[PDB]
Tab-separated table of C-alpha atoms and ligand atoms in Angstrom:
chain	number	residue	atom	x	y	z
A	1	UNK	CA	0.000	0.000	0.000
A	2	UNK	CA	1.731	3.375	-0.843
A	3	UNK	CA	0.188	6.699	0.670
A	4	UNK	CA	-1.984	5.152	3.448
A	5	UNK	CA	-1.594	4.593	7.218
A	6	UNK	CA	-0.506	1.603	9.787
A	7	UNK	CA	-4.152	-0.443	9.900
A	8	UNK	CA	-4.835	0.122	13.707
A	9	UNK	CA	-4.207	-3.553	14.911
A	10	UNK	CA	-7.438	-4.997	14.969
A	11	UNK	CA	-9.235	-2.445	12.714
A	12	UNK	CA	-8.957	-4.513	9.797
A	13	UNK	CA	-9.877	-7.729	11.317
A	14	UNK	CA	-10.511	-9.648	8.160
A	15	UNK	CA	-7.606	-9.271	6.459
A	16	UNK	CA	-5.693	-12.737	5.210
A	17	UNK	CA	-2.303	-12.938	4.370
A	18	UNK	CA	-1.146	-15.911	2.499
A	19	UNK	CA	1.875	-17.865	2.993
A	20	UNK	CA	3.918	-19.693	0.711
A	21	UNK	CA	6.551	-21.948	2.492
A	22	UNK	CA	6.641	-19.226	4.700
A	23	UNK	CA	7.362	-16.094	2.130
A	24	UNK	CA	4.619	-13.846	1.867
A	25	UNK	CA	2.049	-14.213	-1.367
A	26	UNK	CA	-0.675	-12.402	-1.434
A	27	UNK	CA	-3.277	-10.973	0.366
A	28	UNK	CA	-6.827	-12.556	1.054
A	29	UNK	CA	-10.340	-11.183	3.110
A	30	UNK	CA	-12.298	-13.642	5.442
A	31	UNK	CA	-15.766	-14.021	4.431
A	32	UNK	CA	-16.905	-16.844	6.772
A	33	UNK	CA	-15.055	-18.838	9.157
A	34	UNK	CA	-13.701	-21.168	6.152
A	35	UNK	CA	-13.506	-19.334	3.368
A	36	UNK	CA	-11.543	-17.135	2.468
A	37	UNK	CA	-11.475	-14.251	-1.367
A	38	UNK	CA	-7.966	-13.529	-2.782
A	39	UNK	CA	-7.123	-13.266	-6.657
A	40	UNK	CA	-6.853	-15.758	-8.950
A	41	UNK	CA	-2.888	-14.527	-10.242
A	42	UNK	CA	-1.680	-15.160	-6.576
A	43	UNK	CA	-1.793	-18.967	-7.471
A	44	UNK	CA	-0.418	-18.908	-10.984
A	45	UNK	CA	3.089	-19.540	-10.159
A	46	UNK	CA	2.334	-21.847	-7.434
A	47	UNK	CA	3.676	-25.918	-7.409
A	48	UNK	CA	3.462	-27.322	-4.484
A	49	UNK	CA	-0.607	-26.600	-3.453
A	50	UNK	CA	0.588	-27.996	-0.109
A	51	UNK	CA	2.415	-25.466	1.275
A	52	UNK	CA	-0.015	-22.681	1.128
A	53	UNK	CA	-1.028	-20.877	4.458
A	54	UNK	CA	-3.519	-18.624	5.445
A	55	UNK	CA	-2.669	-16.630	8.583
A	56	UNK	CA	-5.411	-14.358	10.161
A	57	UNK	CA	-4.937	-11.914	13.359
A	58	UNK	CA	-1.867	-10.603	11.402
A	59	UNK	CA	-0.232	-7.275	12.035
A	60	UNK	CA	2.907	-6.969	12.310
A	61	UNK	CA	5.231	-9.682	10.847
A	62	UNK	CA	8.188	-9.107	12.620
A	63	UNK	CA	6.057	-10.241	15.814
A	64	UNK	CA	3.556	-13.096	17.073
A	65	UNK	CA	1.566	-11.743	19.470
A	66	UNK	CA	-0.966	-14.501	19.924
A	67	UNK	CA	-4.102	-13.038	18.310
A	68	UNK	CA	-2.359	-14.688	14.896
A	69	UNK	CA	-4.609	-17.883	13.700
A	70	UNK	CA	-2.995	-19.960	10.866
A	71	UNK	CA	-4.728	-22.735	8.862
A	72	UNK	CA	-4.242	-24.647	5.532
A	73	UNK	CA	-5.674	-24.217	2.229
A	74	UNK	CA	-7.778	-26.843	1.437
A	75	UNK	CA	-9.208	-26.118	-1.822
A	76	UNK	CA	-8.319	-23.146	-4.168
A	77	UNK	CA	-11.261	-22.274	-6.492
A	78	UNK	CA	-11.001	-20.766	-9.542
A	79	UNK	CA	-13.536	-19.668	-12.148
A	80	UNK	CA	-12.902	-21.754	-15.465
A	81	UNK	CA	-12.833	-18.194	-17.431
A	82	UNK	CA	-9.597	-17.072	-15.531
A	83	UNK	CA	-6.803	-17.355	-18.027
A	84	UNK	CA	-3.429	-17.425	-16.059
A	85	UNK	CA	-1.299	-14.595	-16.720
A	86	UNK	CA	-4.188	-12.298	-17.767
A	87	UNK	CA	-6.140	-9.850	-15.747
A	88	UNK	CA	-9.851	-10.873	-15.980
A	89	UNK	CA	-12.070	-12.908	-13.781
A	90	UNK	CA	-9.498	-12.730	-11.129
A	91	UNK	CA	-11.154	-14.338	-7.899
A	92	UNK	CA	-9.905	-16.681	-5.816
A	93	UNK	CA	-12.452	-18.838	-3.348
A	94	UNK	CA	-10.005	-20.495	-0.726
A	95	UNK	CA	-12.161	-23.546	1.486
A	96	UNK	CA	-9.554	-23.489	4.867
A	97	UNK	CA	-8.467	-26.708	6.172
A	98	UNK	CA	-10.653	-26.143	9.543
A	99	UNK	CA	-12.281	-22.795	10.560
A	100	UNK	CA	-10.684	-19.910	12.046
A	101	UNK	CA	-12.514	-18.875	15.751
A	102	UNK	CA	-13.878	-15.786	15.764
A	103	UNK	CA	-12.204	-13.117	18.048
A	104	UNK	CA	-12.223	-9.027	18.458
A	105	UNK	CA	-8.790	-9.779	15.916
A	106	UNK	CA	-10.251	-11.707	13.373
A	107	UNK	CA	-13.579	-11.155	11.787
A	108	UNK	CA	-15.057	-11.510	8.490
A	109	UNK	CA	-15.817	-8.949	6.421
A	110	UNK	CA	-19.695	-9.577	5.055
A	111	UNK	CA	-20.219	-10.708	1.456
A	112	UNK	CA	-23.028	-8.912	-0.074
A	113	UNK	CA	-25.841	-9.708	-2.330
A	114	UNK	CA	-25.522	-8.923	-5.692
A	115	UNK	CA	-28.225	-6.740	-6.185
A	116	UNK	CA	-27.444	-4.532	-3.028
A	117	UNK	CA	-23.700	-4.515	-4.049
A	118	UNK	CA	-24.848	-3.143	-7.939
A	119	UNK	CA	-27.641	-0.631	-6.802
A	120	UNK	CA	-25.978	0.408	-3.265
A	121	UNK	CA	-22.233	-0.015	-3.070
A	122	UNK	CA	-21.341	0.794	-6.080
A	123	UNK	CA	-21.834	3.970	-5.713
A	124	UNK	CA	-20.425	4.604	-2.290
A	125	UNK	CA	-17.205	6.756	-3.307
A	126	UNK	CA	-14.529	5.364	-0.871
A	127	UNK	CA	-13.472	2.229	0.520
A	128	UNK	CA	-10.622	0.921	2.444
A	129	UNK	CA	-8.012	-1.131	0.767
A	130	UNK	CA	-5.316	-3.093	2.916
A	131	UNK	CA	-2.066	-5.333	3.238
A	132	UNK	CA	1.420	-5.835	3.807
A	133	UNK	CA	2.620	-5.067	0.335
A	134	UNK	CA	5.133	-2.805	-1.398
A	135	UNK	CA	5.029	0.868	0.778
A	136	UNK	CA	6.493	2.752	-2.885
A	137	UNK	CA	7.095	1.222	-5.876
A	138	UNK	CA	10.136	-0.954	-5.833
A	139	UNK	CA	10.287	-0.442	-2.319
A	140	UNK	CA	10.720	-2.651	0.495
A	141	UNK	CA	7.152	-4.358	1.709
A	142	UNK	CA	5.332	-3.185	5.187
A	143	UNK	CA	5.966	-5.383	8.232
A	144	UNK	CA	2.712	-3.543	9.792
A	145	UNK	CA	-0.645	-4.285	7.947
A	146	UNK	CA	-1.348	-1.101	5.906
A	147	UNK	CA	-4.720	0.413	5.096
A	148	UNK	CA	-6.060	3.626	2.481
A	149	UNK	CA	-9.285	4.984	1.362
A	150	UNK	CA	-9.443	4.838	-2.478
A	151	UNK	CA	-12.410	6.696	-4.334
A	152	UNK	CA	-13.863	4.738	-7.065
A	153	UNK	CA	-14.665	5.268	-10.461
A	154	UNK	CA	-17.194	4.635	-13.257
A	155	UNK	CA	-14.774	2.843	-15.460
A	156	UNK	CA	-16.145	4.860	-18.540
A	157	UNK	CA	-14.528	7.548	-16.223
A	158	UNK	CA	-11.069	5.999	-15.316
A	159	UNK	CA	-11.005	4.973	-19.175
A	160	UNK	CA	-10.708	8.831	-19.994
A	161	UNK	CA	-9.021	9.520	-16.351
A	162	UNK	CA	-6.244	7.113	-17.831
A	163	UNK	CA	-3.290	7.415	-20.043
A	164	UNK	CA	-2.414	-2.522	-22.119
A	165	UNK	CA	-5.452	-4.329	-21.107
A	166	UNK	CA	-9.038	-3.331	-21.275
A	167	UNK	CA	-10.961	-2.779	-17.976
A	168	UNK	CA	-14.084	-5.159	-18.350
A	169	UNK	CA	-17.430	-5.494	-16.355
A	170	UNK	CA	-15.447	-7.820	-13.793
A	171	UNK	CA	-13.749	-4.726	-12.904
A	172	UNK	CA	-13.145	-1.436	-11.485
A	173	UNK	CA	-10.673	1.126	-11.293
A	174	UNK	CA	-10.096	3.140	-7.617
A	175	UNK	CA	-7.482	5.260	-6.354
A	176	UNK	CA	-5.615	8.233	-8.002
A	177	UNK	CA	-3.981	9.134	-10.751
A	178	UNK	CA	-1.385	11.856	-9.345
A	179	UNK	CA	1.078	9.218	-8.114
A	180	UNK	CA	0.760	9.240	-4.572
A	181	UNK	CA	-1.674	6.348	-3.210
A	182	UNK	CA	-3.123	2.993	-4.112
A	183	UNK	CA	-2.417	-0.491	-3.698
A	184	UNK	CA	0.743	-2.543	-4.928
A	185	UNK	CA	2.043	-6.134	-5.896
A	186	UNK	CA	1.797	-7.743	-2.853
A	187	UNK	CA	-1.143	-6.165	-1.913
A	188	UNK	CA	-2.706	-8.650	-4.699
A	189	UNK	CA	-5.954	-10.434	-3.783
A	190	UNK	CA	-6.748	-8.563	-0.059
A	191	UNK	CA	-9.737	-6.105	0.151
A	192	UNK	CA	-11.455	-3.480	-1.129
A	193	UNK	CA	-13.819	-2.893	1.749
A	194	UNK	CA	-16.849	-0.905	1.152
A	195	UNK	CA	-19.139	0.653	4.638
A	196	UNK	CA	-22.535	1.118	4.625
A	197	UNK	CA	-24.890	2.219	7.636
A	198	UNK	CA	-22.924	0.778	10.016
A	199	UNK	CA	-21.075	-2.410	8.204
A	200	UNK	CA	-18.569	-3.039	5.911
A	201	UNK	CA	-18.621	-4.867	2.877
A	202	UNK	CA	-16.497	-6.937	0.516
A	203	UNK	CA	-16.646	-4.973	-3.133
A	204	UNK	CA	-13.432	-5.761	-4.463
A	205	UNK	CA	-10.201	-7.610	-4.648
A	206	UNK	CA	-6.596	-5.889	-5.276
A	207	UNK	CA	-6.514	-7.390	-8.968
A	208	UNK	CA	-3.820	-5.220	-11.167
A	209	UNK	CA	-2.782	-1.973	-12.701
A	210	UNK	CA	0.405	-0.146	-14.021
A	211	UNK	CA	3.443	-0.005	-11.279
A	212	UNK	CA	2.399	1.452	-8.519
A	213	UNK	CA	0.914	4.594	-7.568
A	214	UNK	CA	1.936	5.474	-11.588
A	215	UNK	CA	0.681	8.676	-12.372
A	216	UNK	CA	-1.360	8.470	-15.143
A	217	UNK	CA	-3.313	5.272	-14.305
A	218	UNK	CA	-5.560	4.049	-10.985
A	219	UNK	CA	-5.665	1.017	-9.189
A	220	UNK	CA	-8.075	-1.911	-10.725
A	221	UNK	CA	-9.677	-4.440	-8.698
A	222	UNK	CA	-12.183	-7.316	-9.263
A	223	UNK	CA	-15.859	-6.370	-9.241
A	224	UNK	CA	-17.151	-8.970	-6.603
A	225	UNK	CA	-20.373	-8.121	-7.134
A	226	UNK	CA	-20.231	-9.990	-10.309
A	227	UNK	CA	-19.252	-13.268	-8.107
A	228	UNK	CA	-21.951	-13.571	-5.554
A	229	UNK	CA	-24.166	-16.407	-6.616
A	230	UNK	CA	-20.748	-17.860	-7.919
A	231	UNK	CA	-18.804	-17.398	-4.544
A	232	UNK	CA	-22.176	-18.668	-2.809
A	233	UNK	CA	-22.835	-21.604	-4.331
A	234	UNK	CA	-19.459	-23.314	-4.293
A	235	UNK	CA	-19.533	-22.681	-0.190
A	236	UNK	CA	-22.595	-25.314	-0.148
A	237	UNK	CA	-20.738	-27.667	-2.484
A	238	UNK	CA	-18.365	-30.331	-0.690
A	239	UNK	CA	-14.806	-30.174	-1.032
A	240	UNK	CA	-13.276	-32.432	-3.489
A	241	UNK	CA	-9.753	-34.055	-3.693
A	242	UNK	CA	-6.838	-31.760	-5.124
A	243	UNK	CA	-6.130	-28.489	-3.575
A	244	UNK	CA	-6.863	-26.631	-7.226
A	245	UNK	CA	-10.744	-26.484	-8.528
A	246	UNK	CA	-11.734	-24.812	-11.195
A	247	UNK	CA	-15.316	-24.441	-11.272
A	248	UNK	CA	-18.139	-22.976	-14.217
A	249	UNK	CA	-18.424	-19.257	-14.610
A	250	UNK	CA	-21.107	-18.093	-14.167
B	1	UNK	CA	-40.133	2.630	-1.913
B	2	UNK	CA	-38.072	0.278	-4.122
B	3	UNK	CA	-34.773	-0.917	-3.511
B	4	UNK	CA	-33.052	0.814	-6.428
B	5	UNK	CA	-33.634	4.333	-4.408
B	6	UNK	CA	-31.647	4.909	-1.460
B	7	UNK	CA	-31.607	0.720	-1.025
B	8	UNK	CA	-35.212	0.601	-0.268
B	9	UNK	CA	-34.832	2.257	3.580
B	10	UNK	CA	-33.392	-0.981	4.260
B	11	UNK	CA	-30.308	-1.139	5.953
B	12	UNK	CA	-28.665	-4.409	4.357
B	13	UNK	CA	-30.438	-5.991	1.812
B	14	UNK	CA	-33.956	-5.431	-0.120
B	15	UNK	CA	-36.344	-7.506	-1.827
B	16	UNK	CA	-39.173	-5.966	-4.252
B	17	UNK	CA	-42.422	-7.492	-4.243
B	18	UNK	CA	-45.098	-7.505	-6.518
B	19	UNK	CA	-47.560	-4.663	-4.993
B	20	UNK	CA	-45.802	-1.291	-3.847
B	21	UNK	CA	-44.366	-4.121	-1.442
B	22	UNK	CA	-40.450	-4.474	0.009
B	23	UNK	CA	-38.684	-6.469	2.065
B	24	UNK	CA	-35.577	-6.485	3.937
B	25	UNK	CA	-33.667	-8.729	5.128
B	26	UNK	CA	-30.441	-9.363	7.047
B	27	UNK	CA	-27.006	-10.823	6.285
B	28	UNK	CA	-26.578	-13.775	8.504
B	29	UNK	CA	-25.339	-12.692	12.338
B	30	UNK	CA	-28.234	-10.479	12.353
B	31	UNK	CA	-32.023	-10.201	12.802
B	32	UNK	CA	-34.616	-7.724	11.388
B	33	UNK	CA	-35.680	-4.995	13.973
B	34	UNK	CA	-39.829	-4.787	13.885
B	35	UNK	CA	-39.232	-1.194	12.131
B	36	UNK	CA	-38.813	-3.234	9.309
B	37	UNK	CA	-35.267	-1.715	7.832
B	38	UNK	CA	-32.839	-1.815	10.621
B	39	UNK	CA	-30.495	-5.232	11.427
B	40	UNK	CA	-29.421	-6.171	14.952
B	41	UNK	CA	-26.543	-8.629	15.283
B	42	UNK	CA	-27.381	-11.751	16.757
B	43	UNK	CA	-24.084	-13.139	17.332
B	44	UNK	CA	-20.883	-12.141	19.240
B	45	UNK	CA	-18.761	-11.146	16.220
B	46	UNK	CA	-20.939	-10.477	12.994
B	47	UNK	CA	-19.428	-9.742	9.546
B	48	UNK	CA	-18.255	-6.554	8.848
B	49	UNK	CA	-17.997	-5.039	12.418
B	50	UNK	CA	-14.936	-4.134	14.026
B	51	UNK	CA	-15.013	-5.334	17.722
B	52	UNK	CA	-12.439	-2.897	19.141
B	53	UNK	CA	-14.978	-0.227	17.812
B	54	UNK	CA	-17.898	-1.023	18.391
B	55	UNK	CA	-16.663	-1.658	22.097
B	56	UNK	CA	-15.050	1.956	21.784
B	57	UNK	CA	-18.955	2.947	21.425
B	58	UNK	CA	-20.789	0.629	23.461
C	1	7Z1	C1	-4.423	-10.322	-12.874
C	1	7Z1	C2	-2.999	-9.941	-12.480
C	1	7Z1	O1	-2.507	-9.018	-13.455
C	1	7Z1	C3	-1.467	-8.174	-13.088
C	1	7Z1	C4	-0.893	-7.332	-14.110
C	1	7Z1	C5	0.124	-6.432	-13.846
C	1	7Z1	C6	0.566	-6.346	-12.528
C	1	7Z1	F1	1.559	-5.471	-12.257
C	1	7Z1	C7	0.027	-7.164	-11.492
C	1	7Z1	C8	0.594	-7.081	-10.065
C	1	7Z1	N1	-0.501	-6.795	-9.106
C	1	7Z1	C9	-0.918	-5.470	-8.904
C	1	7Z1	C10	-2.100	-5.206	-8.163
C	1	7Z1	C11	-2.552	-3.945	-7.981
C	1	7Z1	C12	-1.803	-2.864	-8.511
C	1	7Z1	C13	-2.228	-1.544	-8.310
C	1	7Z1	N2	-3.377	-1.263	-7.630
C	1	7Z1	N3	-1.527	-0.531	-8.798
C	1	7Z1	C14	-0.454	-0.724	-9.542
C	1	7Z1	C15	0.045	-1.995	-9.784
C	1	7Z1	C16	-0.632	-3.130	-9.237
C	1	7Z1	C17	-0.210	-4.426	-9.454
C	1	7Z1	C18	1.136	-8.458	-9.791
C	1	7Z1	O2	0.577	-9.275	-9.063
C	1	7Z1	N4	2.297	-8.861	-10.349
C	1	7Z1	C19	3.166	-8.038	-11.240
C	1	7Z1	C20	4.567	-8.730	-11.188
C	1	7Z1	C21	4.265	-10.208	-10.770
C	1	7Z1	C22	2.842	-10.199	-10.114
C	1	7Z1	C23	1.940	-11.239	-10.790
C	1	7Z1	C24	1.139	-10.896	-11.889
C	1	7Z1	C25	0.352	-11.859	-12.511
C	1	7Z1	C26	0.383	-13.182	-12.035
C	1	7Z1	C27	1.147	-13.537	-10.942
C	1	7Z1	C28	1.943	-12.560	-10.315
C	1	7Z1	C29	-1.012	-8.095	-11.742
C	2	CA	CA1	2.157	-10.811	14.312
C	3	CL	CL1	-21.931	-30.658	-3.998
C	4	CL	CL1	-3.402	-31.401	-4.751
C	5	CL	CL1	-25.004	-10.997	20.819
């Protein structure tokens, strides 16, 4: 995250960070105590399934603390019209190998319906973006779990805003295009956290965009409104063998 | 009211009905107050709360 603040340690109580052997991946949000949203790109380089770990009740890496929760990945899902090493349709369901437990440090962040996410959220100007990437571009990555507000865009808007791949209806652009805030790298597949009367919201996923915090361009991030009834019908289905599913979009 | 406009009054999610009729309804964790509109959580730790703040206004 460059140009935001230190999340206030258990203000962003959903936030996932994924672990590969150890290293840091990618971000993720908690949605239930199971499952867990990140991007579909985080897992395009990845070979051995087995290693992959989501932590929860992180803050600040260079510490544990004890509010930190770890668990497997049991399943990565995937829709089947994610192309690796493209930008579109870049969701990520993760099933965990057994739940988190709820605490004042971890918390999920509420998936909404479709229809309330299109008419209401959508047009709700900021929302918080977080994790523990890249603080300026090719810069070092934060040890404490960053957070910024990012104003979002009608991508008809960000399209002139702007000046490589298209920016489809399974996205939307946030952020700024002066150069001084918006998510990075290995910010890639955390939240884009949307409040309404009282509660917040997942609305989008750190997806892609041009360096970081380039002027000239804003940050783009799945539209996870276009996912619901996706997203919601794969947590009824049973898991099945093999870490990696890819499942029917729509 | 309809959902489309200012969510229906609801504050989660709204159904339209055939009629000049609406319902809300609440994200699991919470419960519909009898004004019809507002959700309660039901549970100790509800999606998209933040404990630590809604204890620093309790
Ligand atoms: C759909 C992903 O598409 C792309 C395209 C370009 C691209 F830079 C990225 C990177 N992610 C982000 C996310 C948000 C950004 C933002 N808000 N502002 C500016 C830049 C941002 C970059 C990324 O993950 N990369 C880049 C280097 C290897 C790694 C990777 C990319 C792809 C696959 C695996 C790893 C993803
Ligand atoms: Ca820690
Ligand atoms: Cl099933
Ligand atoms: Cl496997
Ligand atoms: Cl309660």
């Amino acid at each position: 995250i460059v140009g935001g603040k230190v999340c206030p340690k258990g203000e962003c109580p959903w936030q996932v960070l994924l672990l590969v052997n150890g290293a840091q991946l990618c971000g993720g949000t908690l949605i239930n105590t199971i499952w867990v949203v990140s991007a579909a790109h985080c897992f395009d380089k990845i070979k051995n399934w087995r290693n992959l770990i989501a932590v929860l009740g992180e803050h600040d890496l260079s510490e544990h603390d004890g509010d930190e929760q770890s668990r497997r990945v049991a399943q990565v899902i995937i829709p089947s019209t994610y192309v690796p090493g493209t930008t579109n349709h870049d969701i990520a369901l993760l099933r965990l190998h057994q739940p988190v437990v709820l605490t004042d440090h971890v918390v999920p962040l509420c998936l909404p319906e479709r229809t309330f996410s299109e008419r209401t959220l959508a047009f709700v100007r900021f929302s918080l973006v977080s994790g523990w990437g890249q603080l300026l571009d090719r810069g070092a990555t934060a040890l404490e779990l960053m957070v910024l507000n990012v104003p979002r865009l009608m991508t008809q808007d960000c399209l002139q805003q702007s000046r490589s791949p298209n920016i489809t209806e399974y996205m939307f652009c946030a952020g700024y295009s002066d150069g001084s805030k918006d998510s990075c790298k290995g910010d890639s597949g955390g939240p884009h956290a949307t409040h309404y009367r009282g509660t917040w919201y997942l609305t989008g996923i750190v997806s892609w965009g041009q360096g970081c915090a380039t002027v000239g361009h804003f940050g783009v991030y799945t539209r996870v409104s276009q996912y619901i009834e996706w997203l919601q019908k794969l947590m009824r289905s049973e898991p099945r063998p093999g870490v990696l599913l890819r499942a029917p979009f729509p | 009211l309809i959902c489309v406009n200012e969510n229906g009054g609801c504050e989660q999610y709204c159904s339209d009905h055939t009629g000049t009729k609406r319902s809300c309804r609440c994200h699991e964790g919470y419960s519909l107050l009898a004004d019809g509109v507002s959700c309660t959580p039901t549970v100790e730790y509800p999606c998209g709360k933040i404990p630590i703040l809604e204890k620093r206004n309790a």
